[PDB]
Amino acid sequence: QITPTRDLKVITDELQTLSSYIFHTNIVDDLNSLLTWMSPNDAKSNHQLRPPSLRIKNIIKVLFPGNTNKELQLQLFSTLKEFYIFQVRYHFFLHFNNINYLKDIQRWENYYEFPLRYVPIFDVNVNDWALELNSLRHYLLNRNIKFKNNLRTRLDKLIMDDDFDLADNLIQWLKSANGSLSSTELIVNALYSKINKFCEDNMSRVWNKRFMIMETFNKFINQYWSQFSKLVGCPEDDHELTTTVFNCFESNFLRIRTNEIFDICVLAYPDSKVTLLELRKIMKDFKDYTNIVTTFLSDFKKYILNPSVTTVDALLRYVKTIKAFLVLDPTGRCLHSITT
Amino acid sequence: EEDVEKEEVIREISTPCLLPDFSKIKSIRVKMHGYFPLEVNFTKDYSASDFFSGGTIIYIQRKSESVFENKASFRNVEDIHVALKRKAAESKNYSRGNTTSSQLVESLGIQDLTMVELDTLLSAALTDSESYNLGLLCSDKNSGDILDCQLELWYKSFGPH
């Protein structure tokens, strides 16, 4: 993506000479009025988000109603393009340090492209305007760390409050920029945060239900999977993504149950027996068992092993955990560890 | 060789599996998401028995997940599925933040090696002999953050000062 620049003075001198030779008229002063209007360097002579007068539009119609005239006209466009290329980036570099939010870059884009509608310079078949826009976006991503962090926070907030359309626009902007923050990492983190919070909202302290992880997964899929697939762009029938999402759901279910295992076994038993059997289907590693016991001892000793607690209720709760863990663990090795 | 004179059949097996006799094996390759691929083909000169004579175990190198590797553009495909699997695996250790050094170098804003180096070099000048060398970097046939260097050179040449 190589772009040439031939200095503001030279291209301006080339422009006035070409207009004087081709037009043989004193439109140079009026040509100078146009370049200032398209110029965002001077805030007094530019558009300021205001439509141009009849003078500017008539000139454009004159400029936009043999072979030497065509090529002289063609090199003019390139020279006008080079002048505007000089003019936009210098303005962008003037306000480079003032960018902190996405809304700032969008309004600056509108500020730059405001004259574009009134004077067509960019050919339809070549997406030249988009190229430097992505170039400026790429540099802003790769030079402003504070902007990069603000984009991360803004996308995380937008995905948290279910503003999916604006999130999609943000993802499209990042992909077009092609910066060192690829959208794939952002959507992964946003999806991971969203599923964690949805899991925390839904399966917290609810143990009466059976096969509730299926119920939670189906409810989440019906509520957000179509939107997430639209955000990523992958087909709705991505089987392996759904499998990984389910694997994360059960891992979150395991983690929540490990945290709450004390109230699970002490109070809700035997009403929470069903989800204990379901928990038995998930635990597979020795680390899972050592974490489940060391937490359960920690809370039980924290609460029950107080001598201020009545001894009759302490034993009643104790045997309640013994049967609860015995049903959970047929081997009873965890019972031995608890007993010791 | 399928125990016969036929050409070949691909056979996909797990890792702790008993491969067939060494003299009948022509090539073996290992492919998996992560460690970069390794493939060795056994010609007439060296046999599988000779290759494994020192030991029946072959080592594979670990692909490095380095911030410096992804300077500006991600050459990696970065499949959504394996990214989720990696995120789940990291959370398993986390369950069992700015804690790793990669975030530290990211916070310092020195991730791009070339961009930082040229920024130091351009600080002042711009000798012609060097300028052609920097211009050569912008006009490189194949490189990474080429667009960043071009616009950095433009900022130095005709930016505010």
Swiss-Prot record, chain A:
GO molecular function, one term: ubiquitin protein ligase binding
GO cellular component: anaphase-promoting complex; cytoplasm
Keyword Cell cycle attributed: yes
Major place of residence: cytoplasm
Location of this chain's protein in the cell: Cytoplasm; Nucleus
Keywords of this entry: Cell cycle, Cell division, Cytoplasm, Mitosis, Nucleus, Ubl conjugation pathway
Keyword Oxidoreductase: no
GO annotation, biological process: anaphase-promoting complex-dependent catabolic process; exit from mitosis; metaphase/anaphase transition of mitotic cell cycle; positive regulation of mitotic actomyosin contractile ring contraction; protein K11-linked ubiquitination; protein ubiquitination; regulation of meiotic cell cycle; regulation of mitotic cell cycle
UniProt subunit comment: The APC/C is composed of at least 13 subunits that stay tightly associated throughout the cell cycle: APC1, APC2, APC4, APC5, APC9, APC11, CDC16, CDC23, CDC26, CDC27, DOC1, MND2 and SWM1. APC2 interacts directly with APC11 thereby anchoring APC11 to the core complex.
Family note: Belongs to the cullin family.
Function, as annotated: Component of the anaphase promoting complex/cyclosome (APC/C), a cell cycle-regulated E3 ubiquitin-protein ligase complex that controls progression through mitosis and the G1 phase of the cell cycle. The APC/C is thought to confer substrate specificity and, in the presence of ubiquitin-conjugating E2 enzymes, it catalyzes the formation of protein-ubiquitin conjugates that are subsequently degraded by the 26S proteasome.
Miscellaneous: Present with 432 molecules/cell in log phase SD medium.
Protein's name according to its UniProt entry: Anaphase-promoting complex subunit 2
Annotated gene: APC2
Section of the entire sequence shown: 4 to 366 of 853
Curated annotation (Swiss-Prot), chain B:
Domain of life: Eukaryota
Compartments, record wording: Nucleus; Cytoplasm; Cytoplasm, Cytoskeleton, Spindle pole
Protein family per UniProt: Belongs to the APC1 family.
Function description: Component of the anaphase promoting complex/cyclosome (APC/C), a cell cycle-regulated E3 ubiquitin-protein ligase complex that controls progression through mitosis and the G1 phase of the cell cycle. The APC/C is thought to confer substrate specificity and, in the presence of ubiquitin-conjugating E2 enzymes, it catalyzes the formation of protein-ubiquitin conjugates that are subsequently degraded by the 26S proteasome.
Subunit structure: The APC/C is composed of at least 13 subunits that stay tightly associated throughout the cell cycle: APC1, APC2, APC4, APC5, APC9, APC11, CDC16, CDC23, CDC26, CDC27, DOC1, MND2 and SWM1. APC1 interacts directly with MND2.
Note: Present with 178 molecules/cell in log phase SD medium.
The protein's name in its UniProt record: Anaphase-promoting complex subunit 1
UniProt organism field: Saccharomyces cerevisiae (strain ATCC 204508 / S288c) (Baker's yeast)
